């Protein structure tokens, strides 16, 4: 695993530094690495593929060393090295696709393919080169039990969920109370409603609350908070809880009163913010607890006072909502986000070669089903496959 | 968990169920209310037999639809007792009985919860906007005498009954709004009348009103700033009363689409003033 | 609804809430039922005034206690109407009217499910132990023939009403329980009686019964095995009526501890009517 | 035109065209309708002259405004032939003719695809909710009997015409709604009446109704549930008929606005 | 090329798309068969419809891998090219749209414009190392 | 992980459980169809129920093998940690519950608390060799 990154690092540098006309002292230490790759790899033989429609290929290495005697590199020296690099870079593609496609349930952090088990001998350890990427550095710190961290831009921490809750209801569905929400990606939009507009509430104030637990602990997040849910603002018809009938929701929107956002960790309040919108921070949390309340306005112009009567026909329903959005955070387990394409490389290999459903991952690599039940057996497999997908992205985009 | 008020959580992706509007026609019942001058114009006895064949086309069985009749709005309003599942009574417009029609629809379309009253012992007051005084009988004549904080009348003597203010005389149903928060003294002639205070809970769902002829007057809310027109208020214009009856048999799906079952009839509303 | 079928999860070792006795007395109401022979010996003009000042000691406000009369147990069972929120009924013991006391406590201390009945057209059977036939009116005489698998009377004739056998004779309130499986043909004087089948639900928690004298004669069930004795079937002794009313006014707190309201219906009738 | 086939894309952020209301005035007609007694109180001979000078101020040319009359709502509704580009009518409110004013505005304001009926030879049912029977003439007396499956009458006798169930007696315009699906035998006075099998479409936009008098009495639907008031079912209050015409001449730009052309 | 590579049926949230050049959205409106009295007033049978039904979707591409050069939300290579041309008052040439309008350039994205756009974004990337 | 590893049906006494993290008990009450006259009085058909039916079970783990540190009934490593903190009046820090409450610590047993709890039980095990 450490020597699979070390093969790809000095094939990436060999296509970049060994160019025509360059001075020899620019590449004087790469050629000592590239010659010492070849000496270790000669005489061995490998075999990749076999699962699904992934074809079986056999690999055999018998190459010669590079020359170490020029002052400026010429077109003979480049063209005799390109037909050696192009055989290794085809070998690393078929080892990385052989490993992203396999999985185990007992110990997923171990190598699973036949070729990567064979590269983990002490014969092949002399190919080891620097480990400077983000995923190979966190592969080594976490293997010694030291603290790691991945930096994300808009991480997919919330599974998809769109539902509601009725704290007061009747079969006519004309005097209701409760909340509605959408949790999707890295964004929460909750909105509380009350049809009577707190005409009989004590002190004309109705209290709402919405608690979102996370799956993993986030660290040093940057969060944007805005006092409107724009998705629950228009008239719509909504089905009932069991799909029997439908009910109508015609909102008018007040401002949210007495907003309190809390950031919990094992039930302890780490951060809190009271009527403070814009950008906020959250240093360490795993549970977000939103709290906001509706207050009936005590003074109303004649255009407003017609909307909220005392009797039963309520044609304009009051609505109070919020909107939260995580911009960037630092987690310790691997996730998906909006910047890098490591999830897209894993699913595209499995979909292309028609791979059967195994014992660990959900069918079709569904991210909503995978972050919902994000077991420690799935975490060790998901890190092992995102790290191999990161190695393949250096050579083949 | 009959009296507990637990919340419910439902998704927004559940598929809809089937049509269900043809099962309700099998199980439920229907009652019709018409004035007794309808059968005078009809000139038939078998028109109850006739129409029951016409409801069978729309889906109702032969034993579901019931027919009831009354003489006028005054004598129907003595004690309106409405028993079947879905009730539909069509009244006739009168230009002079303008308040008496809207006092009938205040009882029927809403649901009142009533406590008894004893005039001889006690002095009465209304607490909020929901408390009205509903008196019905053969002949009701109500007189009021408001009192101050010292039990003395304001413009009335508590011994003489002729100085009393008067709000109604000789009706079949009177709904009385007085100033909420003042102790009063009453002079109802309780030989033929019976008064009890009531407070409004919500709408009575399973009944509709079809006004027959005349302009749009109806005022549920005894409140000057509010006169709402619900979906269970209907008006049609008449020339003959066959054409009225073919209209209601044709559109039975739209009459029943806008009225639900009575929420107090269900086994769900167990300890929430059932039925 | 929708929170019916969901479980509720309480816990042990939580702190108790405080008292409810005072706020129960303020908003709610109370009304006792006493025979005419009570007020005859009392023969005061304002003894309703004297009692209502003494309920004021026990937390009840002025306008919450109402008084109602009845002639006897037979005249009380024409229409059993339960008006106020907490009911107590006072029954003087008669050694002769022993079923009629037990018929009254059956109807009042339980909930019923009454469907209409047409006896001159159809044939009726009981379904289980919970199905009873309850008839009430001015005076009626029920005569029933058992019938067979091919609709031939067992020990009677279906066309003869003399060969029918009777289970009641001129009674105000009758609860008739017959054998389960077979059908029956009925003969009730329908001009002064209205027979219906009704199903016993759970008990009603608005009402208690105080026997004034005697011993307990109370099989409010239909089986001879259970003659249960709940804590709302009370009994005292008497030689003066003033001691009876002083016992009720003093020990409201022990009675109200057992009454347990919010089983109140939306109507005042003793049953629930469907069709 | 209008097309249920042949989709039309268009776009947004295109510039609004200029106000073409003036060109609408130059190339159109306008026809007012009034009851006969409105010309009686005015009792001028040249009052059609003095109005056309006042429509010319608002841009209508000197050959486009036409005045027609009728006797009453009972006599206008025998055959309303409306064929100008734009039409408005002036209905005087009568309290007892409340059911006849709704039947006329049903006929005027909506389109109807009509089909003939042979009472003698055929049996007729109504298929659609939007299927109605319109009868016009001098004296329509309509008697209807329903039908079972076995071609036998329900509450009548298919031979005896006395035992039928009538819905109209001697009316110039009758719109009849019967329960749908059941066949029927008919018996009408064919000498002074003509019953037809019409079918409702969308509204007519070249006609408009100005009620002149009491309150809004307009259920131009067939079910008891809906009784809408659209853009051009309007109403005024009157004391002099000569004041009523000044309001119509002044506010042409709002009455023309809520209605469309024939096309 | 008219071949269905991927498909998704009633599956919202995050999805992948391995190789495509045409997106085909399909969705349908269904009238609800059961309606409470507050809903049933909205949709009559007759002609005056005051409340119009609406069904919509929303799609958004977070990150993808193309083979030709484009513009995006992270790097500023398009902004460096237009800022040089606007500063020195450069006349309209034969290839690029007037003012370097990106809506006009991706609409008719010919292979003659692709070779120019790669040659200029690459020079703008070299200048960004020395002078920000 | 939602997979049934072991199951036992009407088998009491001692049982084994090779690998699990969720215990699911299931049992049902059945009314006896035949009853002597002393039993039949207890269960009527009507509403007053003075004798209530009850069905229960009892489970008890004797010994097991975990991978994280815990507390048990044999060794005193939890008692050595709390006795040092209580004796020297140590303020409440950022990780452990106030007073080292084991009910509050196994309820929210985060991976940050697991690394601290192993580091302190191991030091308490070293001190127990020299000083009891
Ligand atoms: C509309 C549909 O396809 N759904 C079916 C319907 O066809 C069928 O008649 C009904 C029988 O109860 O069950 C529904 O689930
Ligand atoms: C009279 C008027 O409204 N002015 C418009 C003017 O704005 C427009 O630019 C021009 C060309 O379309 O046509 C004129 O009629
Ligand atoms: Ca006076
Ligand atoms: Ca009042
Ligand atoms: Ca016999
Ligand atoms: Ca029985
Ligand atoms: Ca007939
Ligand atoms: Ca029809």
Automatic annotation (TrEMBL), chains B, C:
Q: Where is this region: LVD motif?
A: 186-188
Fill in the PTM field for this protein. N-glycosylated.
What's the main place this protein lives? host cell
Per the UniProt entry, the disulfide pairs are 31-84, 114-198, 140-193, 145-156
Enumerate the subcellular locations listed in this protein's record, separating them with semicolons.
Host endoplasmic reticulum lumen; Virion
Assembly and partners? Homotrimer; disulfide-linked. 2 Ca(2+) ions bound at each subunit interface in the trimer hold the trimer together. Interacts with the intermediate capsid protein VP6. Interacts with the outer capsid protein VP5*.
Protein name listed in UniProt: Outer capsid glycoprotein VP7
Which species is listed as the source?
Answer: Rotavirus A
Q: Lineage from the top down?
A: Viruses, Riboviria, Orthornavirae, Duplornaviricota, Resentoviricetes
| Stretch of the intact protein here | 52 to 326 of 326
UniProtKB/TrEMBL annotation, chains E, F:
Q: Where in the cell is it found?
A: Virion
* Modification note: Sumoylated with SUMO1 and SUMO2. Sumoylation of viral proteins seems to have a positive role on viral replication.
Sites where the protein binds Ca(2+):
1, 21
Further information: The VP6 trimer contains a zinc ion located at the center of the molecule. The zinc ion is not essential for either trimerization or transcription activity of the DLP. Zinc-depleted VP6 has an increased sensitivity to proteases.
Assembly, in brief, is: Homotrimer. Interacts with the inner capsid protein VP2. Interacts with the outer capsid glycoprotein VP7. Interacts with the outer capsid protein VP5*.
Q: What does this protein do?
A: Intermediate capsid protein that self assembles to form an icosahedral capsid with a T=13 symmetry, which consists of 230 trimers of VP6, with channels at each of its five-fold vertices. This capsid constitutes the middle concentric layer of the viral mature particle. The innermost VP2 capsid and the intermediate VP6 capsid remain intact following cell entry to protect the dsRNA from degradation and to prevent unfavorable antiviral responses in the host cell during all the replication cycle of the virus.
- Family as reported in the entry's similarity comment: Belongs to the rotavirus VP6 family.
Quote the protein name from its UniProt record.
Intermediate capsid protein VP6
Q: Which organism is it from?
A: Rotavirus A
């Amino acid at each position: 695993m450490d020597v699979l990154y070390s093969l790809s690092k000095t094939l990436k540098d060999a296509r970049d530094k060994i160019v025509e006309g360059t001075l020899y002292s620019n590449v004087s230490d790469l050629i000592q690495q590239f010659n010492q790759m070849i000496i270790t790899m000669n005489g061995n033989e490998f075999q990749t593929g076999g699962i699904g429609n992934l074809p079986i290929r056999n690999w055999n290495f018998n190459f010669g060393l590079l020359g170490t005697t020029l002052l400026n590199l010429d077109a003979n020296y480049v063209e005799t090295a390109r037909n050696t690099i192009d055989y290794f870079v085809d070998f690393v593609d078929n080892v990385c696709m052989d490993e992203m496609v396999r999985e185990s349930q007992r110990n997923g952090i171990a190598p699973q393919s036949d070729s990567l088990r064979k590269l983990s001998a002490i014969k092949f350890k002399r190919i080891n080169f620097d480990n400077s990427s983000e995923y190979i550095e966190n592969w080594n710190l976490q293997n010694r039990r030291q603290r790691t961290g991945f930096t994300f831009h808009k991480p997919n921490i919330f599974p998809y969920s769109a539902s509601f809750t009725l704290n007061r209801s009747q079969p006519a569905h004309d005097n209701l109370m409760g909340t509605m929400w959408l949790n999707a990606g890295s964004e929460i939009q909750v909105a509380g409603f009350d049809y009577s507009c707190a005409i009989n509430a004590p002190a004309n104030i109705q209290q709402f609350e919405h608690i979102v637990p996370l799956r993993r602990v986030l660290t040093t997040a940057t969060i944007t908070l805005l006092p409107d849910a724009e998705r629950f603002s228009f008239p719509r018809v909504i089905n009932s809880a069991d799909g029997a009938t439908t009910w109508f929701f015609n909102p008018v929107i007040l401002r949210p009163n007495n907003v309190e956002v809390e950031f919990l960790l094992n039930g302890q309040i780490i951060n809190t913010y009271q009527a403070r919108f814009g950008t906020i921070v959250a240093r360490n949390f795993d549970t977000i607890r939103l709290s906001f309340q509706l207050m009936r306005p005590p003074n109303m112009t004649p255009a407003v006072a017609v909307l909220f009567p005392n009797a039963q026909p309520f044609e304009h329903h009051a609505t109070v909502g919020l909107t939260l959005r995580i911009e960037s955070a630092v987690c310790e387990s691997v996730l998906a986000d909006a910047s890098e394409t490591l999830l897209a490389n894993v699913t595209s290999v499995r979909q292309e070669y028609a791979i059967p459903v195994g014992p660990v991952f959900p069918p079709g690599m569904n991210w909503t089903d995978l972050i919902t039940n994000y077991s420690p057996s799935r975490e060790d497999n998901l890190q092992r496959v995102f790290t191999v997908a990161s190695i393949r992205s250096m050579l083949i985009k | 968990n009959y009296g507990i008020n637990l919340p419910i959580t439902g998704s927004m992706d559940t598929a809809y169920a089937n049509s269900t509007q043809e099962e309700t026609f099998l199980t439920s019942t229907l009652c019709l209310y018409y004035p007794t001058e309808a059968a005078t114009e009809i000139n038939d006895n078998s028109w109850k037999d006739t129409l029951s064949q016409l409801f069978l086309t729309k889906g109702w069985p032969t034993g579901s639809v019931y027919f009831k009749e009354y003489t006028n709005i005054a004598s129907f309003s003595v004690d309106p007792q409405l028993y079947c599942d879905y009730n539909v009574v069509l009244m006739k417009y009168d230009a002079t009985l303008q308040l008496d029609m809207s006092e009938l629809a205040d009882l029927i379309l809403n649901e009142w919860l009533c406590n008894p009253m004893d005039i001889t012992l006690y002095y009465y007051q209304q607490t909020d906007e929901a408390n009205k005084w509903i008196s019905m009988g053969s002949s009701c004549t109500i007189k009021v005498c408001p009192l101050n904080t010292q039990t003395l009348g304001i413009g009335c003597l508590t011994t003489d009954a002729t100085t009393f203010e008067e709000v109604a005389t000789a009706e079949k149903l009177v709904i009385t709004d007085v100033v909420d928060g003042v102790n009063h003294k009453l002079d109802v002639t309780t030989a033929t009348c019976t008064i009890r205070n009531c407070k409004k809970l919500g709408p009575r769902e399973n009944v509709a009103v079809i006004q027959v002829g005349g302009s749009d007057i109806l005022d549920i809310t005894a409140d000057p700033t509010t006169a709402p027109q619900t979906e269970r208020m209907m008006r049609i214009n008449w020339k003959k009363w066959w054409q009225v009856f073919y209209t209601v048999v044709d559109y039975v799906d739209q009459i029943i689409q806008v009225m639900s079952k009575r929420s107090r009839s269900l086994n769900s509303a167990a300890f929430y003033y059932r039925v």
